[PDB]
Design an enzyme around this catalytic site. Structure first.
Site, PDB file in Angstrom:
ATOM      1  CG  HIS A 269      21.529  36.231  -4.836  1.00 36.47           C
ATOM      2  ND1 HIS A 269      21.519  37.511  -6.051  1.00 36.47           N
ATOM      3  CD2 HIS A 269      21.827  36.883  -3.661  1.00 36.47           C
ATOM      4  CE1 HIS A 269      20.919  38.186  -4.683  1.00 36.47           C
ATOM      5  NE2 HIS A 269      21.672  37.819  -3.473  1.00 36.47           N
TER       6      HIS A 269
ATOM      7  CG  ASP B 159      20.827  37.526  -8.976  1.00 40.55           C
ATOM      8  OD1 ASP B 159      20.875  36.395  -9.347  1.00 40.55           O
ATOM      9  OD2 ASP B 159      21.290  38.390  -8.621  1.00 40.55           O
TER      10      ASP B 159
ATOM     11  CB  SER C 218      17.925  39.339  -3.414  1.00 45.87           C
ATOM     12  OG  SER C 218      19.371  39.850  -3.930  1.00 45.87           O
TER      13      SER C 218
HETATM   14  C1  LIG Z   1      20.987  38.369  -2.124  1.00 50.48           C
HETATM   15  C2  LIG Z   1      20.116  40.410  -2.251  1.00 50.48           C
HETATM   16  O1  LIG Z   1      19.177  39.664  -0.691  1.00 50.48           O
HETATM   17  C3  LIG Z   1      21.511  40.600  -2.336  1.00 50.48           C
HETATM   18  C4  LIG Z   1      20.981  42.215  -3.159  1.00 50.48           C
HETATM   19  C5  LIG Z   1      21.702  43.588  -2.662  1.00 50.48           C
HETATM   20  C6  LIG Z   1      21.316  44.731  -2.687  1.00 50.48           C
HETATM   21  N1  LIG Z   1      22.219  46.112  -2.761  1.00 50.48           N
HETATM   22  C7  LIG Z   1      21.939  47.251  -2.823  1.00 50.48           C
HETATM   23  N2  LIG Z   1      22.353  48.234  -2.223  1.00 50.48           N
HETATM   24  N3  LIG Z   1      20.950  47.331  -4.093  1.00 50.48           N
HETATM   25  N4  LIG Z   1      21.999  40.760  -3.196  1.00 50.48           N
HETATM   26  C8  LIG Z   1      23.684  40.515  -3.023  1.00 50.48           C
HETATM   27  O2  LIG Z   1      24.482  40.891  -2.032  1.00 50.48           O
HETATM   28  C9  LIG Z   1      24.378  39.933  -3.887  1.00 50.48           C
HETATM   29  C10 LIG Z   1      25.388  38.410  -4.442  1.00 50.48           C
HETATM   30  C11 LIG Z   1      26.141  38.158  -4.203  1.00 50.48           C
HETATM   31  C12 LIG Z   1      26.868  39.165  -3.651  1.00 50.48           C
HETATM   32  N5  LIG Z   1      26.024  40.649  -3.742  1.00 50.48           N
HETATM   33  C13 LIG Z   1      26.256  42.043  -4.007  1.00 50.48           C
HETATM   34  O3  LIG Z   1      25.346  42.770  -3.935  1.00 50.48           O
HETATM   35  C14 LIG Z   1      28.066  42.809  -3.065  1.00 50.48           C
HETATM   36  N6  LIG Z   1      27.449  43.472  -2.612  1.00 50.48           N
HETATM   37  C15 LIG Z   1      27.789  43.114  -4.590  1.00 50.48           C
HETATM   38  C16 LIG Z   1      28.576  42.272  -5.514  1.00 50.48           C
HETATM   39  C17 LIG Z   1      29.420  40.348  -5.201  1.00 50.48           C
HETATM   40  C18 LIG Z   1      29.678  39.301  -6.791  1.00 50.48           C
HETATM   41  C19 LIG Z   1      29.318  40.137  -7.576  1.00 50.48           C
HETATM   42  C20 LIG Z   1      28.259  41.088  -7.934  1.00 50.48           C
HETATM   43  C21 LIG Z   1      27.785  42.332  -6.909  1.00 50.48           C
END
Ligand SMILES: *C[C@@](*)(O)[C@H](CCCNC(N)=[NH2+])NC(=O)[C@@H]1CCCN1C(=O)[C@H](N)Cc1ccccc1
Lengths: 27, 249
Positions: free
Chosen positions: B43, B99, B197
């Site tokens: 992602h 992912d 991420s």
């Molecule tokens: C891309 C990364 O930076 C990030 C990591 C976030 C970590 N969160 C915690 N508390 N450890 N990933 C994201 O933000 C991902 C990518 C798409 C949306 N997403 C989410 O985390 C959403 N908040 C929830 C989600 C939406 C769609 C499908 C799965 C999870």
């Protein structure tokens, strides 16, 4: 392979400040 | 990283930073697994809902970088991408299952006291290390709250039992993921956050003293919320794909 071993730590036989928390979690 | 601490110099030598080439913008975290391969979250490269679909030419990577401000000259390295590979069954529509992505560097990075690859788990290292209660370490330059640091942030978190992770979210969770975090009643806190991420969830092998990357920061609900442990791509479960990409035949 040459991985997982850090020159400034494992290679110097020195631990970082928090890796003991990890080892201890294994117990 | 939420509630972490400043990284000691050289403590996470496999740390990689994924930047947008122009304009210059820190996009995500990543990790060095060989002198030419960089592991990240899919992602971070492809996510249609956010108008995301980068190509090799759009990005760059920085390695051995200790300050986002300063430029440790003969310490940090900058590399362009030769090719990007995203897991074929990467599910961005529903739950971010698989992912994971691999980025082949244009030219090899020379190992130093500040740049080294992390090990990928073999079958039995995963078997013994992947246990609820066991702690791993997450690193990143992303948000400190639901801006970001000037130094690499580090936080040690316990792996959470699958049934607990599943009950913590409405997202359809899969075997290709795992969650980690502290219980609400336990004192310490901690989590990854946006911007993190692609970054590694690593564990030290009590068997050979080596650090192994067990997961990739993938997603969560907010950051460091009680009862909301963050999620990670399960690297070992996706090792066959990583192998066929790095060893095409
Ligand atoms: C891309 C990364 O930076 C990030 C990591 C976030 C970590 N969160 C915690 N508390 N450890 N990933 C994201 O933000 C991902 C990518 C798409 C949306 N997403 C989410 O985390 C959403 N908040 C929830 C989600 C939406 C769609 C499908 C799965 C999870």
């Amino acid at each position: 392979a040459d991985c997982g071993l850090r020159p400034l730590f494992e290679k110097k036989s020195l631990e970082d400040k928090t890796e003991r928390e990890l080892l201890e979690s294994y117990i | 990283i939420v509630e972490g601490s400043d990284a000691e110099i050289g403590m996470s030598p496999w740390q990689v930073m994924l930047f947008r080439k122009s304009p210059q913008e820190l996009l995500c975290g990543a990790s060095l697994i060989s002198d030419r391969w960089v592991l990240t979250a899919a992602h971070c490269l492809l996510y249609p809902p956010w108008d995301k679909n980068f190509t090799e030419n759009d990005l760059l990577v920085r390695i051995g970088k200790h300050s986002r401000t300063r430029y440790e000259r003969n310490i940090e390295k900058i590399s362009m991408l030769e090719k990007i590979y995203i897991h074929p069954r990467y599910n961005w529509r529903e739950n971010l299952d698989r992912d994971i992505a691999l980025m082949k560097l244009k030219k090899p990075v020379a190992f130093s006291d500040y740049i080294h690859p992390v090990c990928l788990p073999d079958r039995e290292t995963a078997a013994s290390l992947l246990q609820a209660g066991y702690k791993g370490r997450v690193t990143g330059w992303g948000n400190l709250k639901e801006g970001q640091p000037s130094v690499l942030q580090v936080v040690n978190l316990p792996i959470v039992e699958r049934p607990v992770c599943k009950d913590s979210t409405r997202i359809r969770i899969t075997d290709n993921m795992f969650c980690a975090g502290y219980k609400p009643d336990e004192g310490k806190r901690g989590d990854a956050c946006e911007g993190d991420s692609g970054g590694p969830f690593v564990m030290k092998s009590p068997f050979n003293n080596r650090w192994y990357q067990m997961g990739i920061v993938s997603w969560g609900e907010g950051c460091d919320r009680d009862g909301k442990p963050g999620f990670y791509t399960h690297v070992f479960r996706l090792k066959k794909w990583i192998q066929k990409v790095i060893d095409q035949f």
